[PDB]
Amino acid sequence: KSPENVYPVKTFGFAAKDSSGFFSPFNFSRRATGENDVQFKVLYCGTCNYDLEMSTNKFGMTKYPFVIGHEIVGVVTEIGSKVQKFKVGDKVGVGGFVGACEKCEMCVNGVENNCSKVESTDGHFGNNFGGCCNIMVVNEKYAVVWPENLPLHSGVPLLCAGITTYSPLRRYGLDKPGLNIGIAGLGGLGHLAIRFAKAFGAKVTLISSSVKKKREALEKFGVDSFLLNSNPEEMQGAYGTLDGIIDTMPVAHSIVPFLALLKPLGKLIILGVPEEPFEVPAPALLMGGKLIAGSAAGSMKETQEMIDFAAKHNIVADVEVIPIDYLNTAMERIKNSDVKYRFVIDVGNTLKSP
Amino acid sequence: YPVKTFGFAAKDSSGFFSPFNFSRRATGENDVQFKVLYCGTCNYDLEMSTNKFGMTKYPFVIGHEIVGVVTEIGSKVQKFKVGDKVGVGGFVGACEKCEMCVNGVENNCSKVESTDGHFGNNFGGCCNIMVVNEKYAVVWPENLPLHSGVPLLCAGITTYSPLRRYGLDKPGLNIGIAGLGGLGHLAIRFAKAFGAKVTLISSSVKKKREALEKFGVDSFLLNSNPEEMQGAYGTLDGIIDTMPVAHSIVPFLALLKPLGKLIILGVPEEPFEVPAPALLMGGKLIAGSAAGSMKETQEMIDFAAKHNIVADVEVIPIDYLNTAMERIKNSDVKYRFVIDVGNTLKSPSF
Ligand SMILES: [Zn+2]
Ligand SMILES: [Zn+2]
Ligand SMILES: [Zn+2]
Ligand SMILES: [Zn+2]
């Protein structure tokens, strides 16, 4: 029965035992390194609002005991006999999923993140324990080749917040030099969205409800224009100018002004999840043939491509590195967005054997 | 202008149509002049004639979907000879020198010239003679009937364009059509010819029988039954939604596979309530679409001819036009009125 006795590789980390979401030391086990597997010592594990939501069981479908960790990097300790991509001592990353059915339309076409049988790394779809623990093991297919010129501690949120912004920027053709790209909201998702857009060669506009952020965007993100969305004169002046908009705002807001900012054939991408639904008048879409698209996560192909891109363009996240016994306080901070902009748990140095 | 013409026009916002004399330009070097044989009409003309939106230039000659026969041509005209058949859709000019123009989507130009005069100072094709720049004239194939083909230049292009733009034109795909009206019935016909397994989505049980029996539609979902809608969750590559009435699209997004596309073609007054999770779970999109470009329109006409696609139409004499307008209001026509200008437009008495 007991998780530590199931498999032969003994592991330890931190787990939520109930819907209170309190993380505490947890012993468990993982499979032996099979022929196609990559075992690794976890060095850093990102976290974010998704883990707050899951750990407190916001959707009523969490399986306790729950071990977070959908954005992890570490150092390879063992490789199976048929592994190509890694040798022992190489760095590796694991994102949101570790498996899929490998046979459906989605899998066959390299978009296996959309597999109805996708296997979440943290085991919210399936039975699995996430990488906030000492040792991880993963099928080669689902392991990111992590280059030595991409810092681990500040790179790790690319596997969560990064791919989320990068994927739609490529999918909707918002990655060409000289395009005008808007980002709404300068937080976890938006800050990386800006760094990607800049690297693609876009003229970047920050759209925001707070003037505080204007100076930040200009000084620290090289942002070209700032639009305060509560200022209609400012907003109206940029009508029909943006090729696309990455909307990261989690608060209730209207997207009709955002649709109006787009050129004809332009794209609104929604990445935040307000509790308030959006009100979308048919005419706002039909005038100029505009689209609104949602996006979460990305494929393995897209995730490797992004990490390669980030390494080459020196793109990392703003992070606060924390010891693992700070996890429960970090969750409180995530609740209040009191982090600039992502927590990264230093597992390598601060997780000790029980 | 010197070319002496006559047609029908509305004078005030009553929307009443009567004989109206006017004139067009002589044929320039890039121009095609034709005798009008058929003139499509639709809800757009009802709205513009009654000044729904408040920016209608009177007197208003309708006719944004017309066909006929070439009478004369300009010096530098390549695409037409005299006696050929020809069509004109919803715009006759654009600025030519902008981004939207250079890339072949001039319908998105902000200085775009409407055939009916609405963006511009023009008179539409509900009249004896037309003249248009050759770029904005469609080459009409001999095996496409004129009377039943003319509404393609409006309803046809409107359904065809997004089917192409959003990759919903591949054989084998599961394509939903919501609403079986004017747009709906041509959307079904195009999707069938592309090779798709078509599902009709409708609020009306009457439409189930119509879809199977008359369009060879595979599947039907009633959108007021949650149990039937639940059973098709995550099965469709795209939906073409033509419904003009207030309705939720949260169920429609739910019908889409991951990476699936919802195309809005109707224009309800009620806005759509769209929860973020409905777009985000599956990475789905909602896009608007009306009309299309000249390249696409010509291409759509060749495809319609090649695959025996026409609209269902009621051909009407011109003195029925005012009655036709109450019937367009009541949604009482299967599925588009086509005015027999060629046989029924009389020349005004001297
Ligand atoms: Zn995360
Ligand atoms: Zn699969
Ligand atoms: Zn029409
Ligand atoms: Zn133009």
Residue numbers in the entry:
A (entry chain A): 4 to 357
B (entry chain B): 10 to 359
Wording from the paper:
HYS, which has a distinctly different product profile, was also crystallized to explore the structural basis behind this distinct stereochemical outcome. Structures were obtained for THAS1 and THAS2 with NADP+ bound (THAS1, 1.05 Å resolution; THAS2, 2.10 Å resolution) and in apo form (THAS1, 2.25 Å resolution; THAS2, 2.05 Å resolution), while HYS could only be crystallized in the apo form (2.25 Å resolution). The histidine residue in HYS loop 2 (His127) appears to be positioned appropriately to provide an alternative proton source for the opposite (‘top') face of the substrate, which could explain the appearance of ajmalicine in the product profile of HYS. While the THAS1 mutant containing the swaps displayed reduced activity rather than an altered product profile, the HYS mutant containing the shorter THAS1 loop 2 resulted in a product profile similar to that of THAS1. Therefore, we mutated this histidine to alanine or asparagine in HYS.
The HYSs perform a single, chemically straightforward reduction reaction that immediately neutralizes the reactivity of strictosidine aglycone/cathenamine. The active site cavities of the HYSs are framed by helix α2, the catalytic zinc coordination sphere, and loops 1 and 2, with the NADP(H) co-substrate binding at the base of the active site.
